[PDB]
């Protein structure tokens, strides 16, 4: 039967859930701020966009121990990145990107205390710290030592000196999971239950919001059918998300189910309500306040070029051009096995920024959600393993 797919030792199904066959590609795109001065003086930001910077991923999920008479399994998804100079636009070490200096933006919200605002302000004046800063693509991505964080270490050592969009994340995991193997049913295959032992999320408001649904996102149960809707829990995005059925496609050799990410997921609605930390005050349709799970930094997740978000957002930054073709997030699954064939995962990263009279560095700047960069986590199935799947099916 089609019940050949479960996590059990040695089986072809489980086999590659350990080391997957697929050359997954992550591509970074940065927003270069071309009129930083005027941004401060109060104009509308003008950005240019540089990318792709393409890394190839190495995925191995280790630290495995089974349990509960064979119905559960625990591991960590481990992930690393290899830079390809040919398939990227330029060299991440050579090329420069001018953009927000987040450590200062962060230590500014990190100060909720009046004497802290006072003192932490003194720092920026004396150290000659500006709001907009120029770094190398490699630096922003991976790490650079900031003059400001360097100090905070000498005081409050728990805080790391370095900063990078991904810092200390090359070769590490997104945390320790436990997946329900497909024994108890074919439906609960590679579904998630306990993440760091947390059987629900702590930091949203409503229980619905806090809940953990669906797979890790690299796979689904067999018999995916046109009507039914799929749940996914990407870690870096901080919430449980779901996809809907679009249409029938053929990718490489196989039949496929096109699944996009529907609008009702990121909008202002009674269902999505509990994701607004200000007790029911929402930022708008199409963005997320991730500032809780990002350590308290002013971070806003969104879709590339604000796609699916209230036009009032696309309006705030000139140089934004969302189109469904480039900026959506689809996935193409095999309706029988629940295997992912053609998939492109695209989300953005923004810093919430507004004027502050206490801090001279923020100047007259507009109150807005300000984009730093976005990425495409893609994948494509080659010819060699297309036949092998056509075989097994
Ligand atoms: C990861 O995510 C990013 C997106 O965020 C992807 O990068 C994008 O890739 C797109 C294509 O995959 C690029 O889009 C192209 O942009 C060109 C101009 O910049 C434009 O000329 C292209 O338009 C053609 O393709 C369309 C189909 O997409 C057609 O409808 C259109 O008419 C053009 O197609 C040709 O048309 C002529 C007639 O005019 C025909 O004679 C040709 O035969 C047609 N050829 C084809 C193939 O149709 C297209 O819009 C986009 O620029 C790029 N953006 C960035 C920022 O990188 C990544 O690819 C994605 N995944 C991976 C794995 O990289
Ligand atoms: C993102 O935007 C930023 C800001 O606009 C941009 O940074 C700038 O990059 C240029 C090069 O592309 C840097 O210009 C250099 O500056 C040094 C002095 O600081 C000069 O010595 C250099 O002179 C050369 O210029 C010509 C070649 O470019 C030659 O004719 C000449 O003989 C020299 O070889 C050069 O002008 C500039 O310093 C930065 N600006 C800042 C503030 O860092 C960045 O390049 C953009 N990124 C992308 C990917 O487009
Ligand atoms: C995104 O979410 C963050 C939380 O992660 C929001 O920050 C929170 O803002 C509220 C104000 O609505 C703060 O509440 C008040 O703080 C003061 C000072 O401590 C206190 O005396 C009041 O009683 C009240 O609790 C709250 O402190 C703050 N939370 C954190 C963790 O900083 C933020 O406003 C959201 N961003 C946007 C753009 O909406
Ligand atoms: C992330 O770490 C990996 C693994 O350490 C790096 O990839 C490899 O390791 C060294 C790096 O100097 C070199 O042998 C090659 O670059 C890689 N070899 C193999 C076999 O993969 C990778 O460079 C790191 N990525 C970043 C952006 O730092
Ligand atoms: C997590 O999963 C549950 C069930 O899949 C989602 O709650 C369902 O929501 C729909 C529409 O909101 C209702 O028609 C169902 O009755 C609900 N079922 C249950 C069991 O609650 C919940 O929305 C999901 N949460 C997130 C954050 O995705
Ligand atoms: C697994 O799916 C079946 C199908 O409805 C359900 O009976 C069972 O409760 C699911 N597992 C858990 C832990 O709920
Ligand atoms: C979101 O919608 C609710 C009513 O559905 C409204 O009370 C709230 O103020 C809205 N928030 C925004 C940011 O539009």
Numbering used by the authors: 37 to 429
Paper lines:
SCARB2 is responsible for attachment as well as uncoating of EV71. SCARB2 (residues 37–430) consists of three domains arranged in a “Kidney” shape.
To gain an understanding of the molecular basis of SCARB2-mediated uncoating of EV71 under acidic conditions, we solved the crystal structures of the ectodomain of SCARB2 under both neutral (pH 7.5) (hereafter denoted as nSCARB2) and acidic conditions (pH 4.8) (hereafter denoted as aSCARB2). A striking difference in the position of the “cap” is observed between structures at acidic and neutral pH. The structure of aSCARB2 reveals a penetrable tunnel, which traverses the entire length of the molecule. In contrast, under acidic conditions, we propose that an alteration in the protonation state of H150 triggers the re-arrangement of the linker region connecting α4 with α5 such that the linker is now part of α5. Helix α4 is shortened in length, giving rise to a new linker (residues 146–150), that folds away from α7, connecting a much longer α5 with α4. More importantly, α5 moves towards α15 and together with the conformational change of W146, extends the lipid-transfer tunnel right through to the membrane-distal end of the molecule with an open entrance. This movement is facilitated by formation of new hydrogen bonds by R153 and E157. Under acidic conditions, such as encountered in the late endosome, parts of helices α4 and α5 of the viral binding domain of SCARB2 move away from helix α7, resulting in opening of the lipid-transfer tunnel. When exposed to acid pH in the late endo/lyso-somes, the cap undergoes conformational changes that lead to the opening of the lipid-transfer tunnel.
